């Protein structure tokens, strides 16, 4: 009944899925965030002049350009902060090994001492093989072939010695397993501890996953509220006024043609 | 208020002809800015609904299967959220910029229609009035040269003076008909030129007080097209955390180990008194 394969297969499924979570986090920033982090800030932030002479209707354009960039400073944070959490999968994907390679090899050694001792017991099933040949002497003595009784002594002394083996191998193999019913309950209990705390790790480390992106959502949303604030301070009648002084060409009327006379210099 | 755009002759028109070409260069720079932001977000949703829908079969199952899958099914919510963003940018935002681009160029013709008619009519007279003042002040040099030579060479002789009255009629001729008249055709044109030009400055001022309000109301749409995604993403975050509060530790009740009735006493007892006794 080598059913340690079932509790040892539970360990094959604790790291083949932890790999997926760490693969997902490792992928949800290079296949998701290496785009906005890069494309938003990098491809943007030029010195292309807004060329709006309006000191105010220009505050809102750069405000839209700035908050495009103060939106990307927040997807970079997730790219950083969430690849500084996948590094907590390895403090479980390899810390669990500290909790499952210590009381596993220490339990393997005893688990095979049983295996050959029982094989030594089934090998010492000769108490039966000489009992079979003992009875067949007694069976054939009903015919009385006159000194089979000497043979019967032999198998009688033989049976005595060879069950003294069987009783010896049986009491030993008894406590070898009686001390394995005990110690196997300790791996049953220990595995149910760190296969129950792995779930608290999974749940608590995934609850801190959305709280890592919910920050990102509230960041750029709060930054979008800043594009509407910069967009409310605009007062237009003062704006063209400020813009006229720049592009102003002339304020006095083009004086009219007057008829120049003859006595100008007479 | 925009009366103060007169200047010398053509500075005003060219100062106002550069403002429209610069104003148009503001909106097209704003238009393209959406196009660049558009495909950026469009690439964001491509990868996400790729990443979300690229599901695979792994030994996970049970009440913890919800949370892991909750994470996969909310990366497709982001894609849907940010595809709408880019969608709302090229369909609504960019296209409505192309609206005011064309509406205004068609309105920038109606405003100043006959400006070059009067500007060139005013120039024709300006130079032609200068052609006439040119002759008038050459016509008076000769007269002075005939009334100043007679000044030093006084009337001490007997020569017919008809040189003066012959050319005095010229001075009146060239002056009156050709200067006091084209200086009055220029006046009536000028007084209308000031009128029409004053109404063209007023007409673009009104246009400029729209472009500023339009840009504000357009970028306000831009801000709220993004806030659409932000609350969508934020709401789908509690959906992750709603499915994490649903997780109790009973998934280890999903047991596969074959036990509970095994591990017997095992003191093998073949005494071989089964029959033999």
From Swiss-Prot, chain B:
Subcellular location: Cytoplasm, Cytoskeleton
Domain (F-BAR): residue spans on this chain: 1-252
Signal peptide limits: none
Residue stretches in coiled coil: 87-186
Domain remark text: The N-terminal region is in a coiled coil structure.
Function: After the onset of mitosis, forms a ring-like structure which colocalizes with the medial actin ring. Appears to mediate cytoskeletal rearrangements required for cytokinesis. Essential for viability.
Protein name: Cell division control protein 15
């Amino acid at each position: 009944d080598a059913l340690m394969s079932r509790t040892k297969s539970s360990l094959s499924v604790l790291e083949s899925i932890d790999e997926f979570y760490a693969k997902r986090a490792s992928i949800e920033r290079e296949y998701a965030s290496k785009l906005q982090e890069l494309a938003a800030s990098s491809a943007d932030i030029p010195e292309v002049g807004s060329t709006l002479n309006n000191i105010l209707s220009m505050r809102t354009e750069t405000g839209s350009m700035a908050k495009a960039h103060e939106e990307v400073s927040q997807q970079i944070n997730t790219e950083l902060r969430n690849k500084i959490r996948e590094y907590i999968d390895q403090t479980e994907q390899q810390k669990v090994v500290a909790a499952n390679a210590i009381e596993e090899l220490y339990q393997k050694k005893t688990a095979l001492e049983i295996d050959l001792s029982k094989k030594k017991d089934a090998y010492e099933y000769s108490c039966n093989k000489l009992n079979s040949y003992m009875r067949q002497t007694k069976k054939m003595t009903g015919r009385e072939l006159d000194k089979y009784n000497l043979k019967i002594r032999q198998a009688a002394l033989a049976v005595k010695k060879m069950d003294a083996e069987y009783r010896e191998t049986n009491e030993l193999l008894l406590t070898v397993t009686r001390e394995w019913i005990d110690r196997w309950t300790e791996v049953c209990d220990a595995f149910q501890h760190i296969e129950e705390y792995r779930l608290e790790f999974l749940k608590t480390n995934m609850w801190a996953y959305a709280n890592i992106i919910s920050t990102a959502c509230v960041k750029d949303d709060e930054s979008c509220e800043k594009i509407r604030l910069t967009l409310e301070n605009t007062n237009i009648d003062e704006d063209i006024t400020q813009m006229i002084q720049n592009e102003g060409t002339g304020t006095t009327i083009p004086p009219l043609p007057e008829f120049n006379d003859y006595f100008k210099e007479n």
